[PDB]
Design a protein around this ligand. Structure first.
Ligand SMILES: Nc1ncnc2c1ncn2[C@@H]1O[C@H](COP(=O)(O)OP(=O)(O)OP(=O)(O)O)[C@@H](O)[C@H]1O
Ligand SMILES: Nc1ncnc2c1ncn2[C@@H]1O[C@H](COP(=O)(O)OP(=O)(O)OP(=O)(O)O)[C@@H](O)[C@H]1O
Ligand SMILES: Nc1ncnc2c1ncn2[C@@H]1O[C@H](COP(=O)(O)OP(=O)(O)OP(=O)(O)O)[C@@H](O)[C@H]1O
Ligand SMILES: Nc1ncnc2c1ncn2[C@@H]1O[C@H](COP(=O)(O)OP(=O)(O)OP(=O)(O)O)[C@@H](O)[C@H]1O
Ligand SMILES: Nc1ncnc2c1ncn2[C@@H]1O[C@H](COP(=O)(O)OP(=O)(O)OP(=O)(O)O)[C@@H](O)[C@H]1O
Ligand SMILES: Nc1ncnc2c1ncn2[C@@H]1O[C@H](COP(=O)(O)OP(=O)(O)OP(=O)(O)O)[C@@H](O)[C@H]1O
Ligand SMILES: [Mg+2]
Ligand SMILES: [Mg+2]
Ligand SMILES: [Mg+2]
Lengths: 484, 484, 484
């Protein structure tokens, strides 16, 4: 074969995008990580998908876990391996030791096994093979040099056999040596590292393709999750800037606002409402969500600050009934503390919720709340994620941000996101005659003309009422004006 | 001889600049790095180029990878080694063990290997030799002392034969010892370290020539990329300050602007448009791009904030049709998230795009977007990169920058680039009578006179209209003037 | 000289200052460093200078490099050891092993070597001795204890013989133990450490004299460079504050300014021009340069922001022809990116350029550019260097500094250098009636009276025109004054 490297799809969501096709065929791929990083899961999901998506039988060699457990555990993801074993599509080669035994059986079985495996490969016409914890085999009494030969032998034979393999290795340090003996790294044709980085009492899983001899792939780490559907990876850096854009308009839920936006919000756009606490972002959200229901359209409200019940109370006090919105199955409220999960998990929950409800509009109450603790870079990555998904999905999105300081705020967002959003609505307190009045302002709109006036507005039982600007004032933006 | 030490070109883009001529002839060069750093690639690219550019036969010794694979993978770069083997220009000397290994081979092989290597060198009249992973050989059961002799022997013999060799070693820590045994460094006459530094979930490939006994070379790390054309290194610190400069002018796409600049931008210049989001940099960029097509000249718009579709919707709404621009093959829009790659990659993609399209004008919408996450020094290095490349290429370039704070901004650029640019255009909001108006100002122009007025400007369907200055105001730079 | 120990001069530039006279005679000096730090170069230069300057025969003991290579490599610095070996002034003692060898020899050889070296020393009437990489000798299979005895033996015998020796050693960590076996440090009389510190992708070489039993010396690290002339050290802390001072005046190239400076700049003085980008520092520099040529005097313009071409285009646009300046051989322009090298290198390049051109005036356009990345302490050290050299050299110098923030800048320099400079010229933007006007100001002059006005000035084709002060304004320094 005088062509480039050929890959085999793993069908593990996200992996084939990072690996630019999947694992290189006929070659072994090393997948190491610390305890509980999801090595086993990867190898199994690798075989399963093979069987279910291309009817390519698979051989699974286990050195520690028992075949019963490997099947028992797989049920966690709704995997019935037991069935595939019967259908002879999957064969679990039990290589685990027994409660009793002897010693001085070094490369003895390393050679016998290279046969026992060759046997099952031929017997079931296997295309995919995964060896779980080869590390544990020579974890009997060997040195780095002895380990390099045994691995090289194994890999080499499997390569002759032409099987595409995935080899599991354990590590002890999240950023230290790639594998226990710091030898596997160089012996494998392909290296995949699964990390379960701590950092601030939170855990964050990331997968990285260190190398793939002969082809290209995406570099660095990528967050992923382990759910009821296995390993889910998000190639946030793979998302293309090819979002669809239209001139269609939609309402904000506030007529006067719609006018200021020169005809309303664009369907294909991301809106940001910024302001100190109390300015009324949460109000605009409510009103934006209600407007989608008034037009019998589905909308989701991801609230990260108020409870399900409180949102109702406050919404009802502003008129708009959220009760009905839910019954009519037009509005879906989520609610969860940012601390209840990492950004990766949240991002996913947001996605799935969107898939199981086909929203036309979406509102995330307080992006700034999700920014708690997390690093600015980990956050921006989350914003680009949710932002983009919504964009390429034709879903109009309204996001809320509470600035750290009321009055005087010199920047729209503290996290610096205003450069990622299409429309910016700015709410601000204005001290006038010993009183705290409000003001609304369409800071920017990429497609429309929008009003440039800073209009004061009040809040009542009816909702928001946008009045006039403070034409006779100076230093308004500062918060503490000066009448001329 | 009675002179310094002659070098041999590797023709590896960039390397010969870093090494002040290439590898020292008749000596061996140690190239080490962690797994997946590009050791092999370097060693092969060294032979291949030797063959293809000077018809200098090469011997490739391999201790782990199979000859078939080595040829297989090289295809990844449109490398046909199998052909060169036939033509007897390249000889792959298989030194790898067999699936049925045997004990103690740390002496027979050394002299036997050299016999073979020597044999092959003589047989094909080899000029270049590269041994891949000498590390693996004594990775049988040896100590630093035993390792030091064997290497010394190997290097010495190769020296006698007069072979200019490339030796590959593996590491385990990106900044720990230079090679496995902490001995190889001192035995080699030349040392090259390939690094694949993590840092923030991203990976950065660098190359450093630690030492070359007998001559000079650039010091420090240098970023490089592995592409379909192999290793590509950018000696960003080797670019000379000898850019060509002329008095030729060019339009901005805005006539009034051109007036304020004393007759338009200089062809040989770098312009920077700074301002808060919404001020209209993205507009000035469009008007800049269009003006290049209206004069039937090719221009590239590297957009890192808006999608391809959006840029078109907003552009049409400002008049100017981007659609036609593309068909006429005068305008090329790229678009991509800054998170989709590291600066090094981006820099390259910008370059290649420039070479395959011979642009006259280039505009990067938001350098400030590419500065996300990345360190300031890494960023400045990128800026100097794209900036100088444009200057020496006679390409007029317009760059965008969004200041983190609207109104009050005390510095032009948060990243501090304004000292690297020729002409600066500043956009800023001005609160006037409860309204958000804009202002445009030619902050500086190195060769021209340019207007000193801070003119207010509106934005319409037609585009940008630069009106008059606020002669009757004070503290305008601040964003909240004081009418007088 | 009040020092209890007789020293021998190395003639290595800067070392004898650091060592307070050179290497103690009849004693051994350990010189250790990581790979590629300059150990061999140091030891060779030590013998070479010994032969060329004092006709002191030298014996060079090599354990790894070959006598041919040592001679071949020395040609890099234009030294012909081969010639010296013939004349019988230099003897290279080959102690390296052969590419056939065995096992066991690092002991009696220690006695065989001792007797060998004593032969050479007696035969050539040697006075200087340098043993390159003694480390590698017991790098056969020894423990810390065995090493200490062997070294002590060697050292001891060398002392009896009366030879002044230089012993080279290798280290693995830049700041870890002094030498491999952590035993050499205490056995030697003097210890010198050569470092090659990374830090931010750049490499900085430093030399330190840790100890000298019996005398004093300069403490700490000192930056040095390896050039075509070998090791070059800069004892930046050895520079005495005894610069010559005169009342002689010189023009700035701008008559009005000269008036402001009470009759022009002082010949013996360092001037600082600070202001935001666009203020015109680059202009004043040009005019400062041109004026030295108009009076048939040589001047160097070190530019770190503009290309050689651009400087010319802009200079011509301001009248003054730089073309002629060069031809007449009165003006020399350099140009180079600050990223093209570390401060140490830059400093040295500036010095050499000054020696090979005997300038009367010098102008570094933008020190603030050389401050990119580098640490403030490393920067100040650079400024004190260039500044001091200039002073003791009767060379007038004009340095430029761009402030990170236009208007509002509360400090003259962000780097805090203004305390090192004699005369400070401040340029700044003044918002007046919706327009950006410039203001020039002589902030301070140590020996003169100077004008205290903050005059506004305009820039034309003719150049800088200094007009009058804004007497009817308040808050001028603020950038946006108030008309009273
Ligand atoms: N349905 C599920 N939903 C979410 N997480 C799950 C589910 N099932 C298992 N997990 C998680 O996945 C992990 C299982 O790891 P796995 O057995 O795949 O291999 P490993 O941790 O890489 O290696 P080892 O064999 O040492 O455990 C556990 O840490 C567990 O918390
Ligand atoms: N019935 C009501 N009548 C008049 N004003 C109301 C009423 N309910 C709430 N408000 C006003 O609205 C404000 C609360 O606004 P809101 O729930 O919209 O969110 P927010 O200001 O964006 O964010 P946060 O959760 O930080 O308060 C209060 O400060 C109050 O002045
Ligand atoms: N066409 C290509 N485009 C981009 N990257 C590629 C391409 N081909 C290979 N690569 C990358 O180059 C690397 C190959 O490294 P290489 O085989 O040259 O040596 P190494 O990693 O230094 O040592 P080892 O022999 O242990 O792998 C892989 O990490 C892979 O991602
Ligand atoms: N049809 C239009 N009519 C009037 N104004 C418009 C129109 N389209 C866009 N605008 C205005 O232009 C602004 C957006 O400007 P632009 O796309 O040029 O880039 P920018 O401000 O430099 O960067 P950013 O991407 O952060 O907005 C909006 O704030 C809006 O007021
Ligand atoms: N003409 C020259 N100009 C600038 N640098 C040079 C020149 N010649 C050699 N060098 C540099 O000097 C260094 C030589 O180091 P040297 O041979 O003196 O000893 P070492 O590095 O301390 O020890 P080792 O014997 O392990 O190499 C190299 O790192 C090389 O880059
Ligand atoms: N022919 C000219 N006529 C009028 N003004 C000019 C002319 N040439 C240049 N200028 C002005 O001088 C400014 C550039 O100044 P200059 O080159 O002196 O250095 P600088 O401001 O100190 O530093 P920087 O390199 O950051 O610009 C421009 O902003 C412009 O207003
Ligand atoms: Mg809220
Ligand atoms: Mg934009
Ligand atoms: Mg300048």
């Amino acid at each position: 074969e005088h062509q480039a490297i050929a890959k085999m799809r793993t069908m593990i969501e996200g992996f084939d995008d990072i690996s630019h096709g999947g694992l290189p065929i006929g070659r072994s791929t090393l997948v190491s990580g610390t305890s509980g990083t999801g090595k086993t899961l990867f190898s199994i999901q690798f075989l399963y998908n093979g069987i279910i998506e291309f009817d390519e039988p698979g051989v699974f060699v286990t050195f520690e876990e028992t075949p019963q457990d490997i099947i028992k555990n797989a049920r966690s993801f709704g995997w019935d391996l037991a069935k595939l074993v019967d259908e002879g599509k999957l064969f679990i080669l039990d290589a685990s030791p027994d409660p009793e035994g002897q010693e001085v059986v070094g490369g003895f079985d390393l050679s016998a096994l290279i046969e026992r495996i060759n046997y099952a490969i031929q017997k079931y016409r296997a295309r995919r093979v995964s060896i779980d914890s080869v590390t544990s085999v020579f974890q009997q009494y060997d040195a780095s040099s002895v380990v390099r030969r045994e691995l090289f032998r194994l890999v080499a034979r499997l390569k002759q056999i032409g099987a595409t393999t995935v080899m599991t290795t354990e590590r002890i340090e999240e950023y230290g040596p790639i594998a226990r003996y710091g030898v596997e790294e160089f012996v494998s044709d392909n290296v995949v590292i699964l990390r379960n980085v701590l950092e601030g009492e939170r855990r964050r899983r990331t997968l990285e393709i260190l190398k793939l001899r002969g082809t290209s792939h995406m570099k660095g780490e990528y967050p992923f999750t382990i759910t009821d559907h296995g390993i889910n990876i998000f190639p946030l850096g793979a998302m293309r800037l090819t979002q669809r854009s239209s001139n269609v308009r939609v309402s904000s839920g506030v007529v006067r606002l719609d006018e200021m936006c020169g005809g309303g919000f664009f369907k294909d756009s991301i809106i940001l409402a910024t302001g100190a606490t109390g300015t009324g972002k949460t109000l605009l959200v409510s009103r934006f969500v209600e407007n989608a229901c008034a037009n019998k359209e589905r909308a989701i409200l991801f609230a990260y600050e108020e409870s399900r019940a409180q949102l109702l109370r406050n919404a009802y006090s502003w008129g708009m009934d959220f009760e009905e919105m839910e019954r009519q199955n037009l509005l879906k409220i989520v609610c969860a503390y940012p601390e209840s999960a990492g950004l990766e998990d949240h991002l996913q929950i947001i996605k799935s919720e969107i898939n199981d409800f086909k929203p036309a509009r979406i509102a995330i109450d307080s992006l700034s709340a999700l920014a708690r603790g997390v690093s600015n870079n980990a956050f921006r990555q989350f914003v680009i994620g949710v932002t983009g998904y919504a964009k390429q999905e034709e879903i109009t999105g309204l996001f809320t941000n509470t600035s750290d300081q009321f009055m005087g705020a010199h920047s729209i967002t503290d996290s610096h996101i205003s450069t990622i959003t299409d429309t910016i609505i700015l709410l601000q307190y204005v001290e006038i005659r010993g009183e705290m009045s409000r003001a609304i302002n369409v800071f920017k709109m990429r497609g429309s003309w929008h009003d440039k006036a800073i209009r004061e507005f009040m809040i009542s039982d009816k909702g928001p009422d946008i009045k006039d600007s403070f034409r006779n004032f100076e230093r308004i933006i500062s918060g503490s004006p000066t009448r001329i």
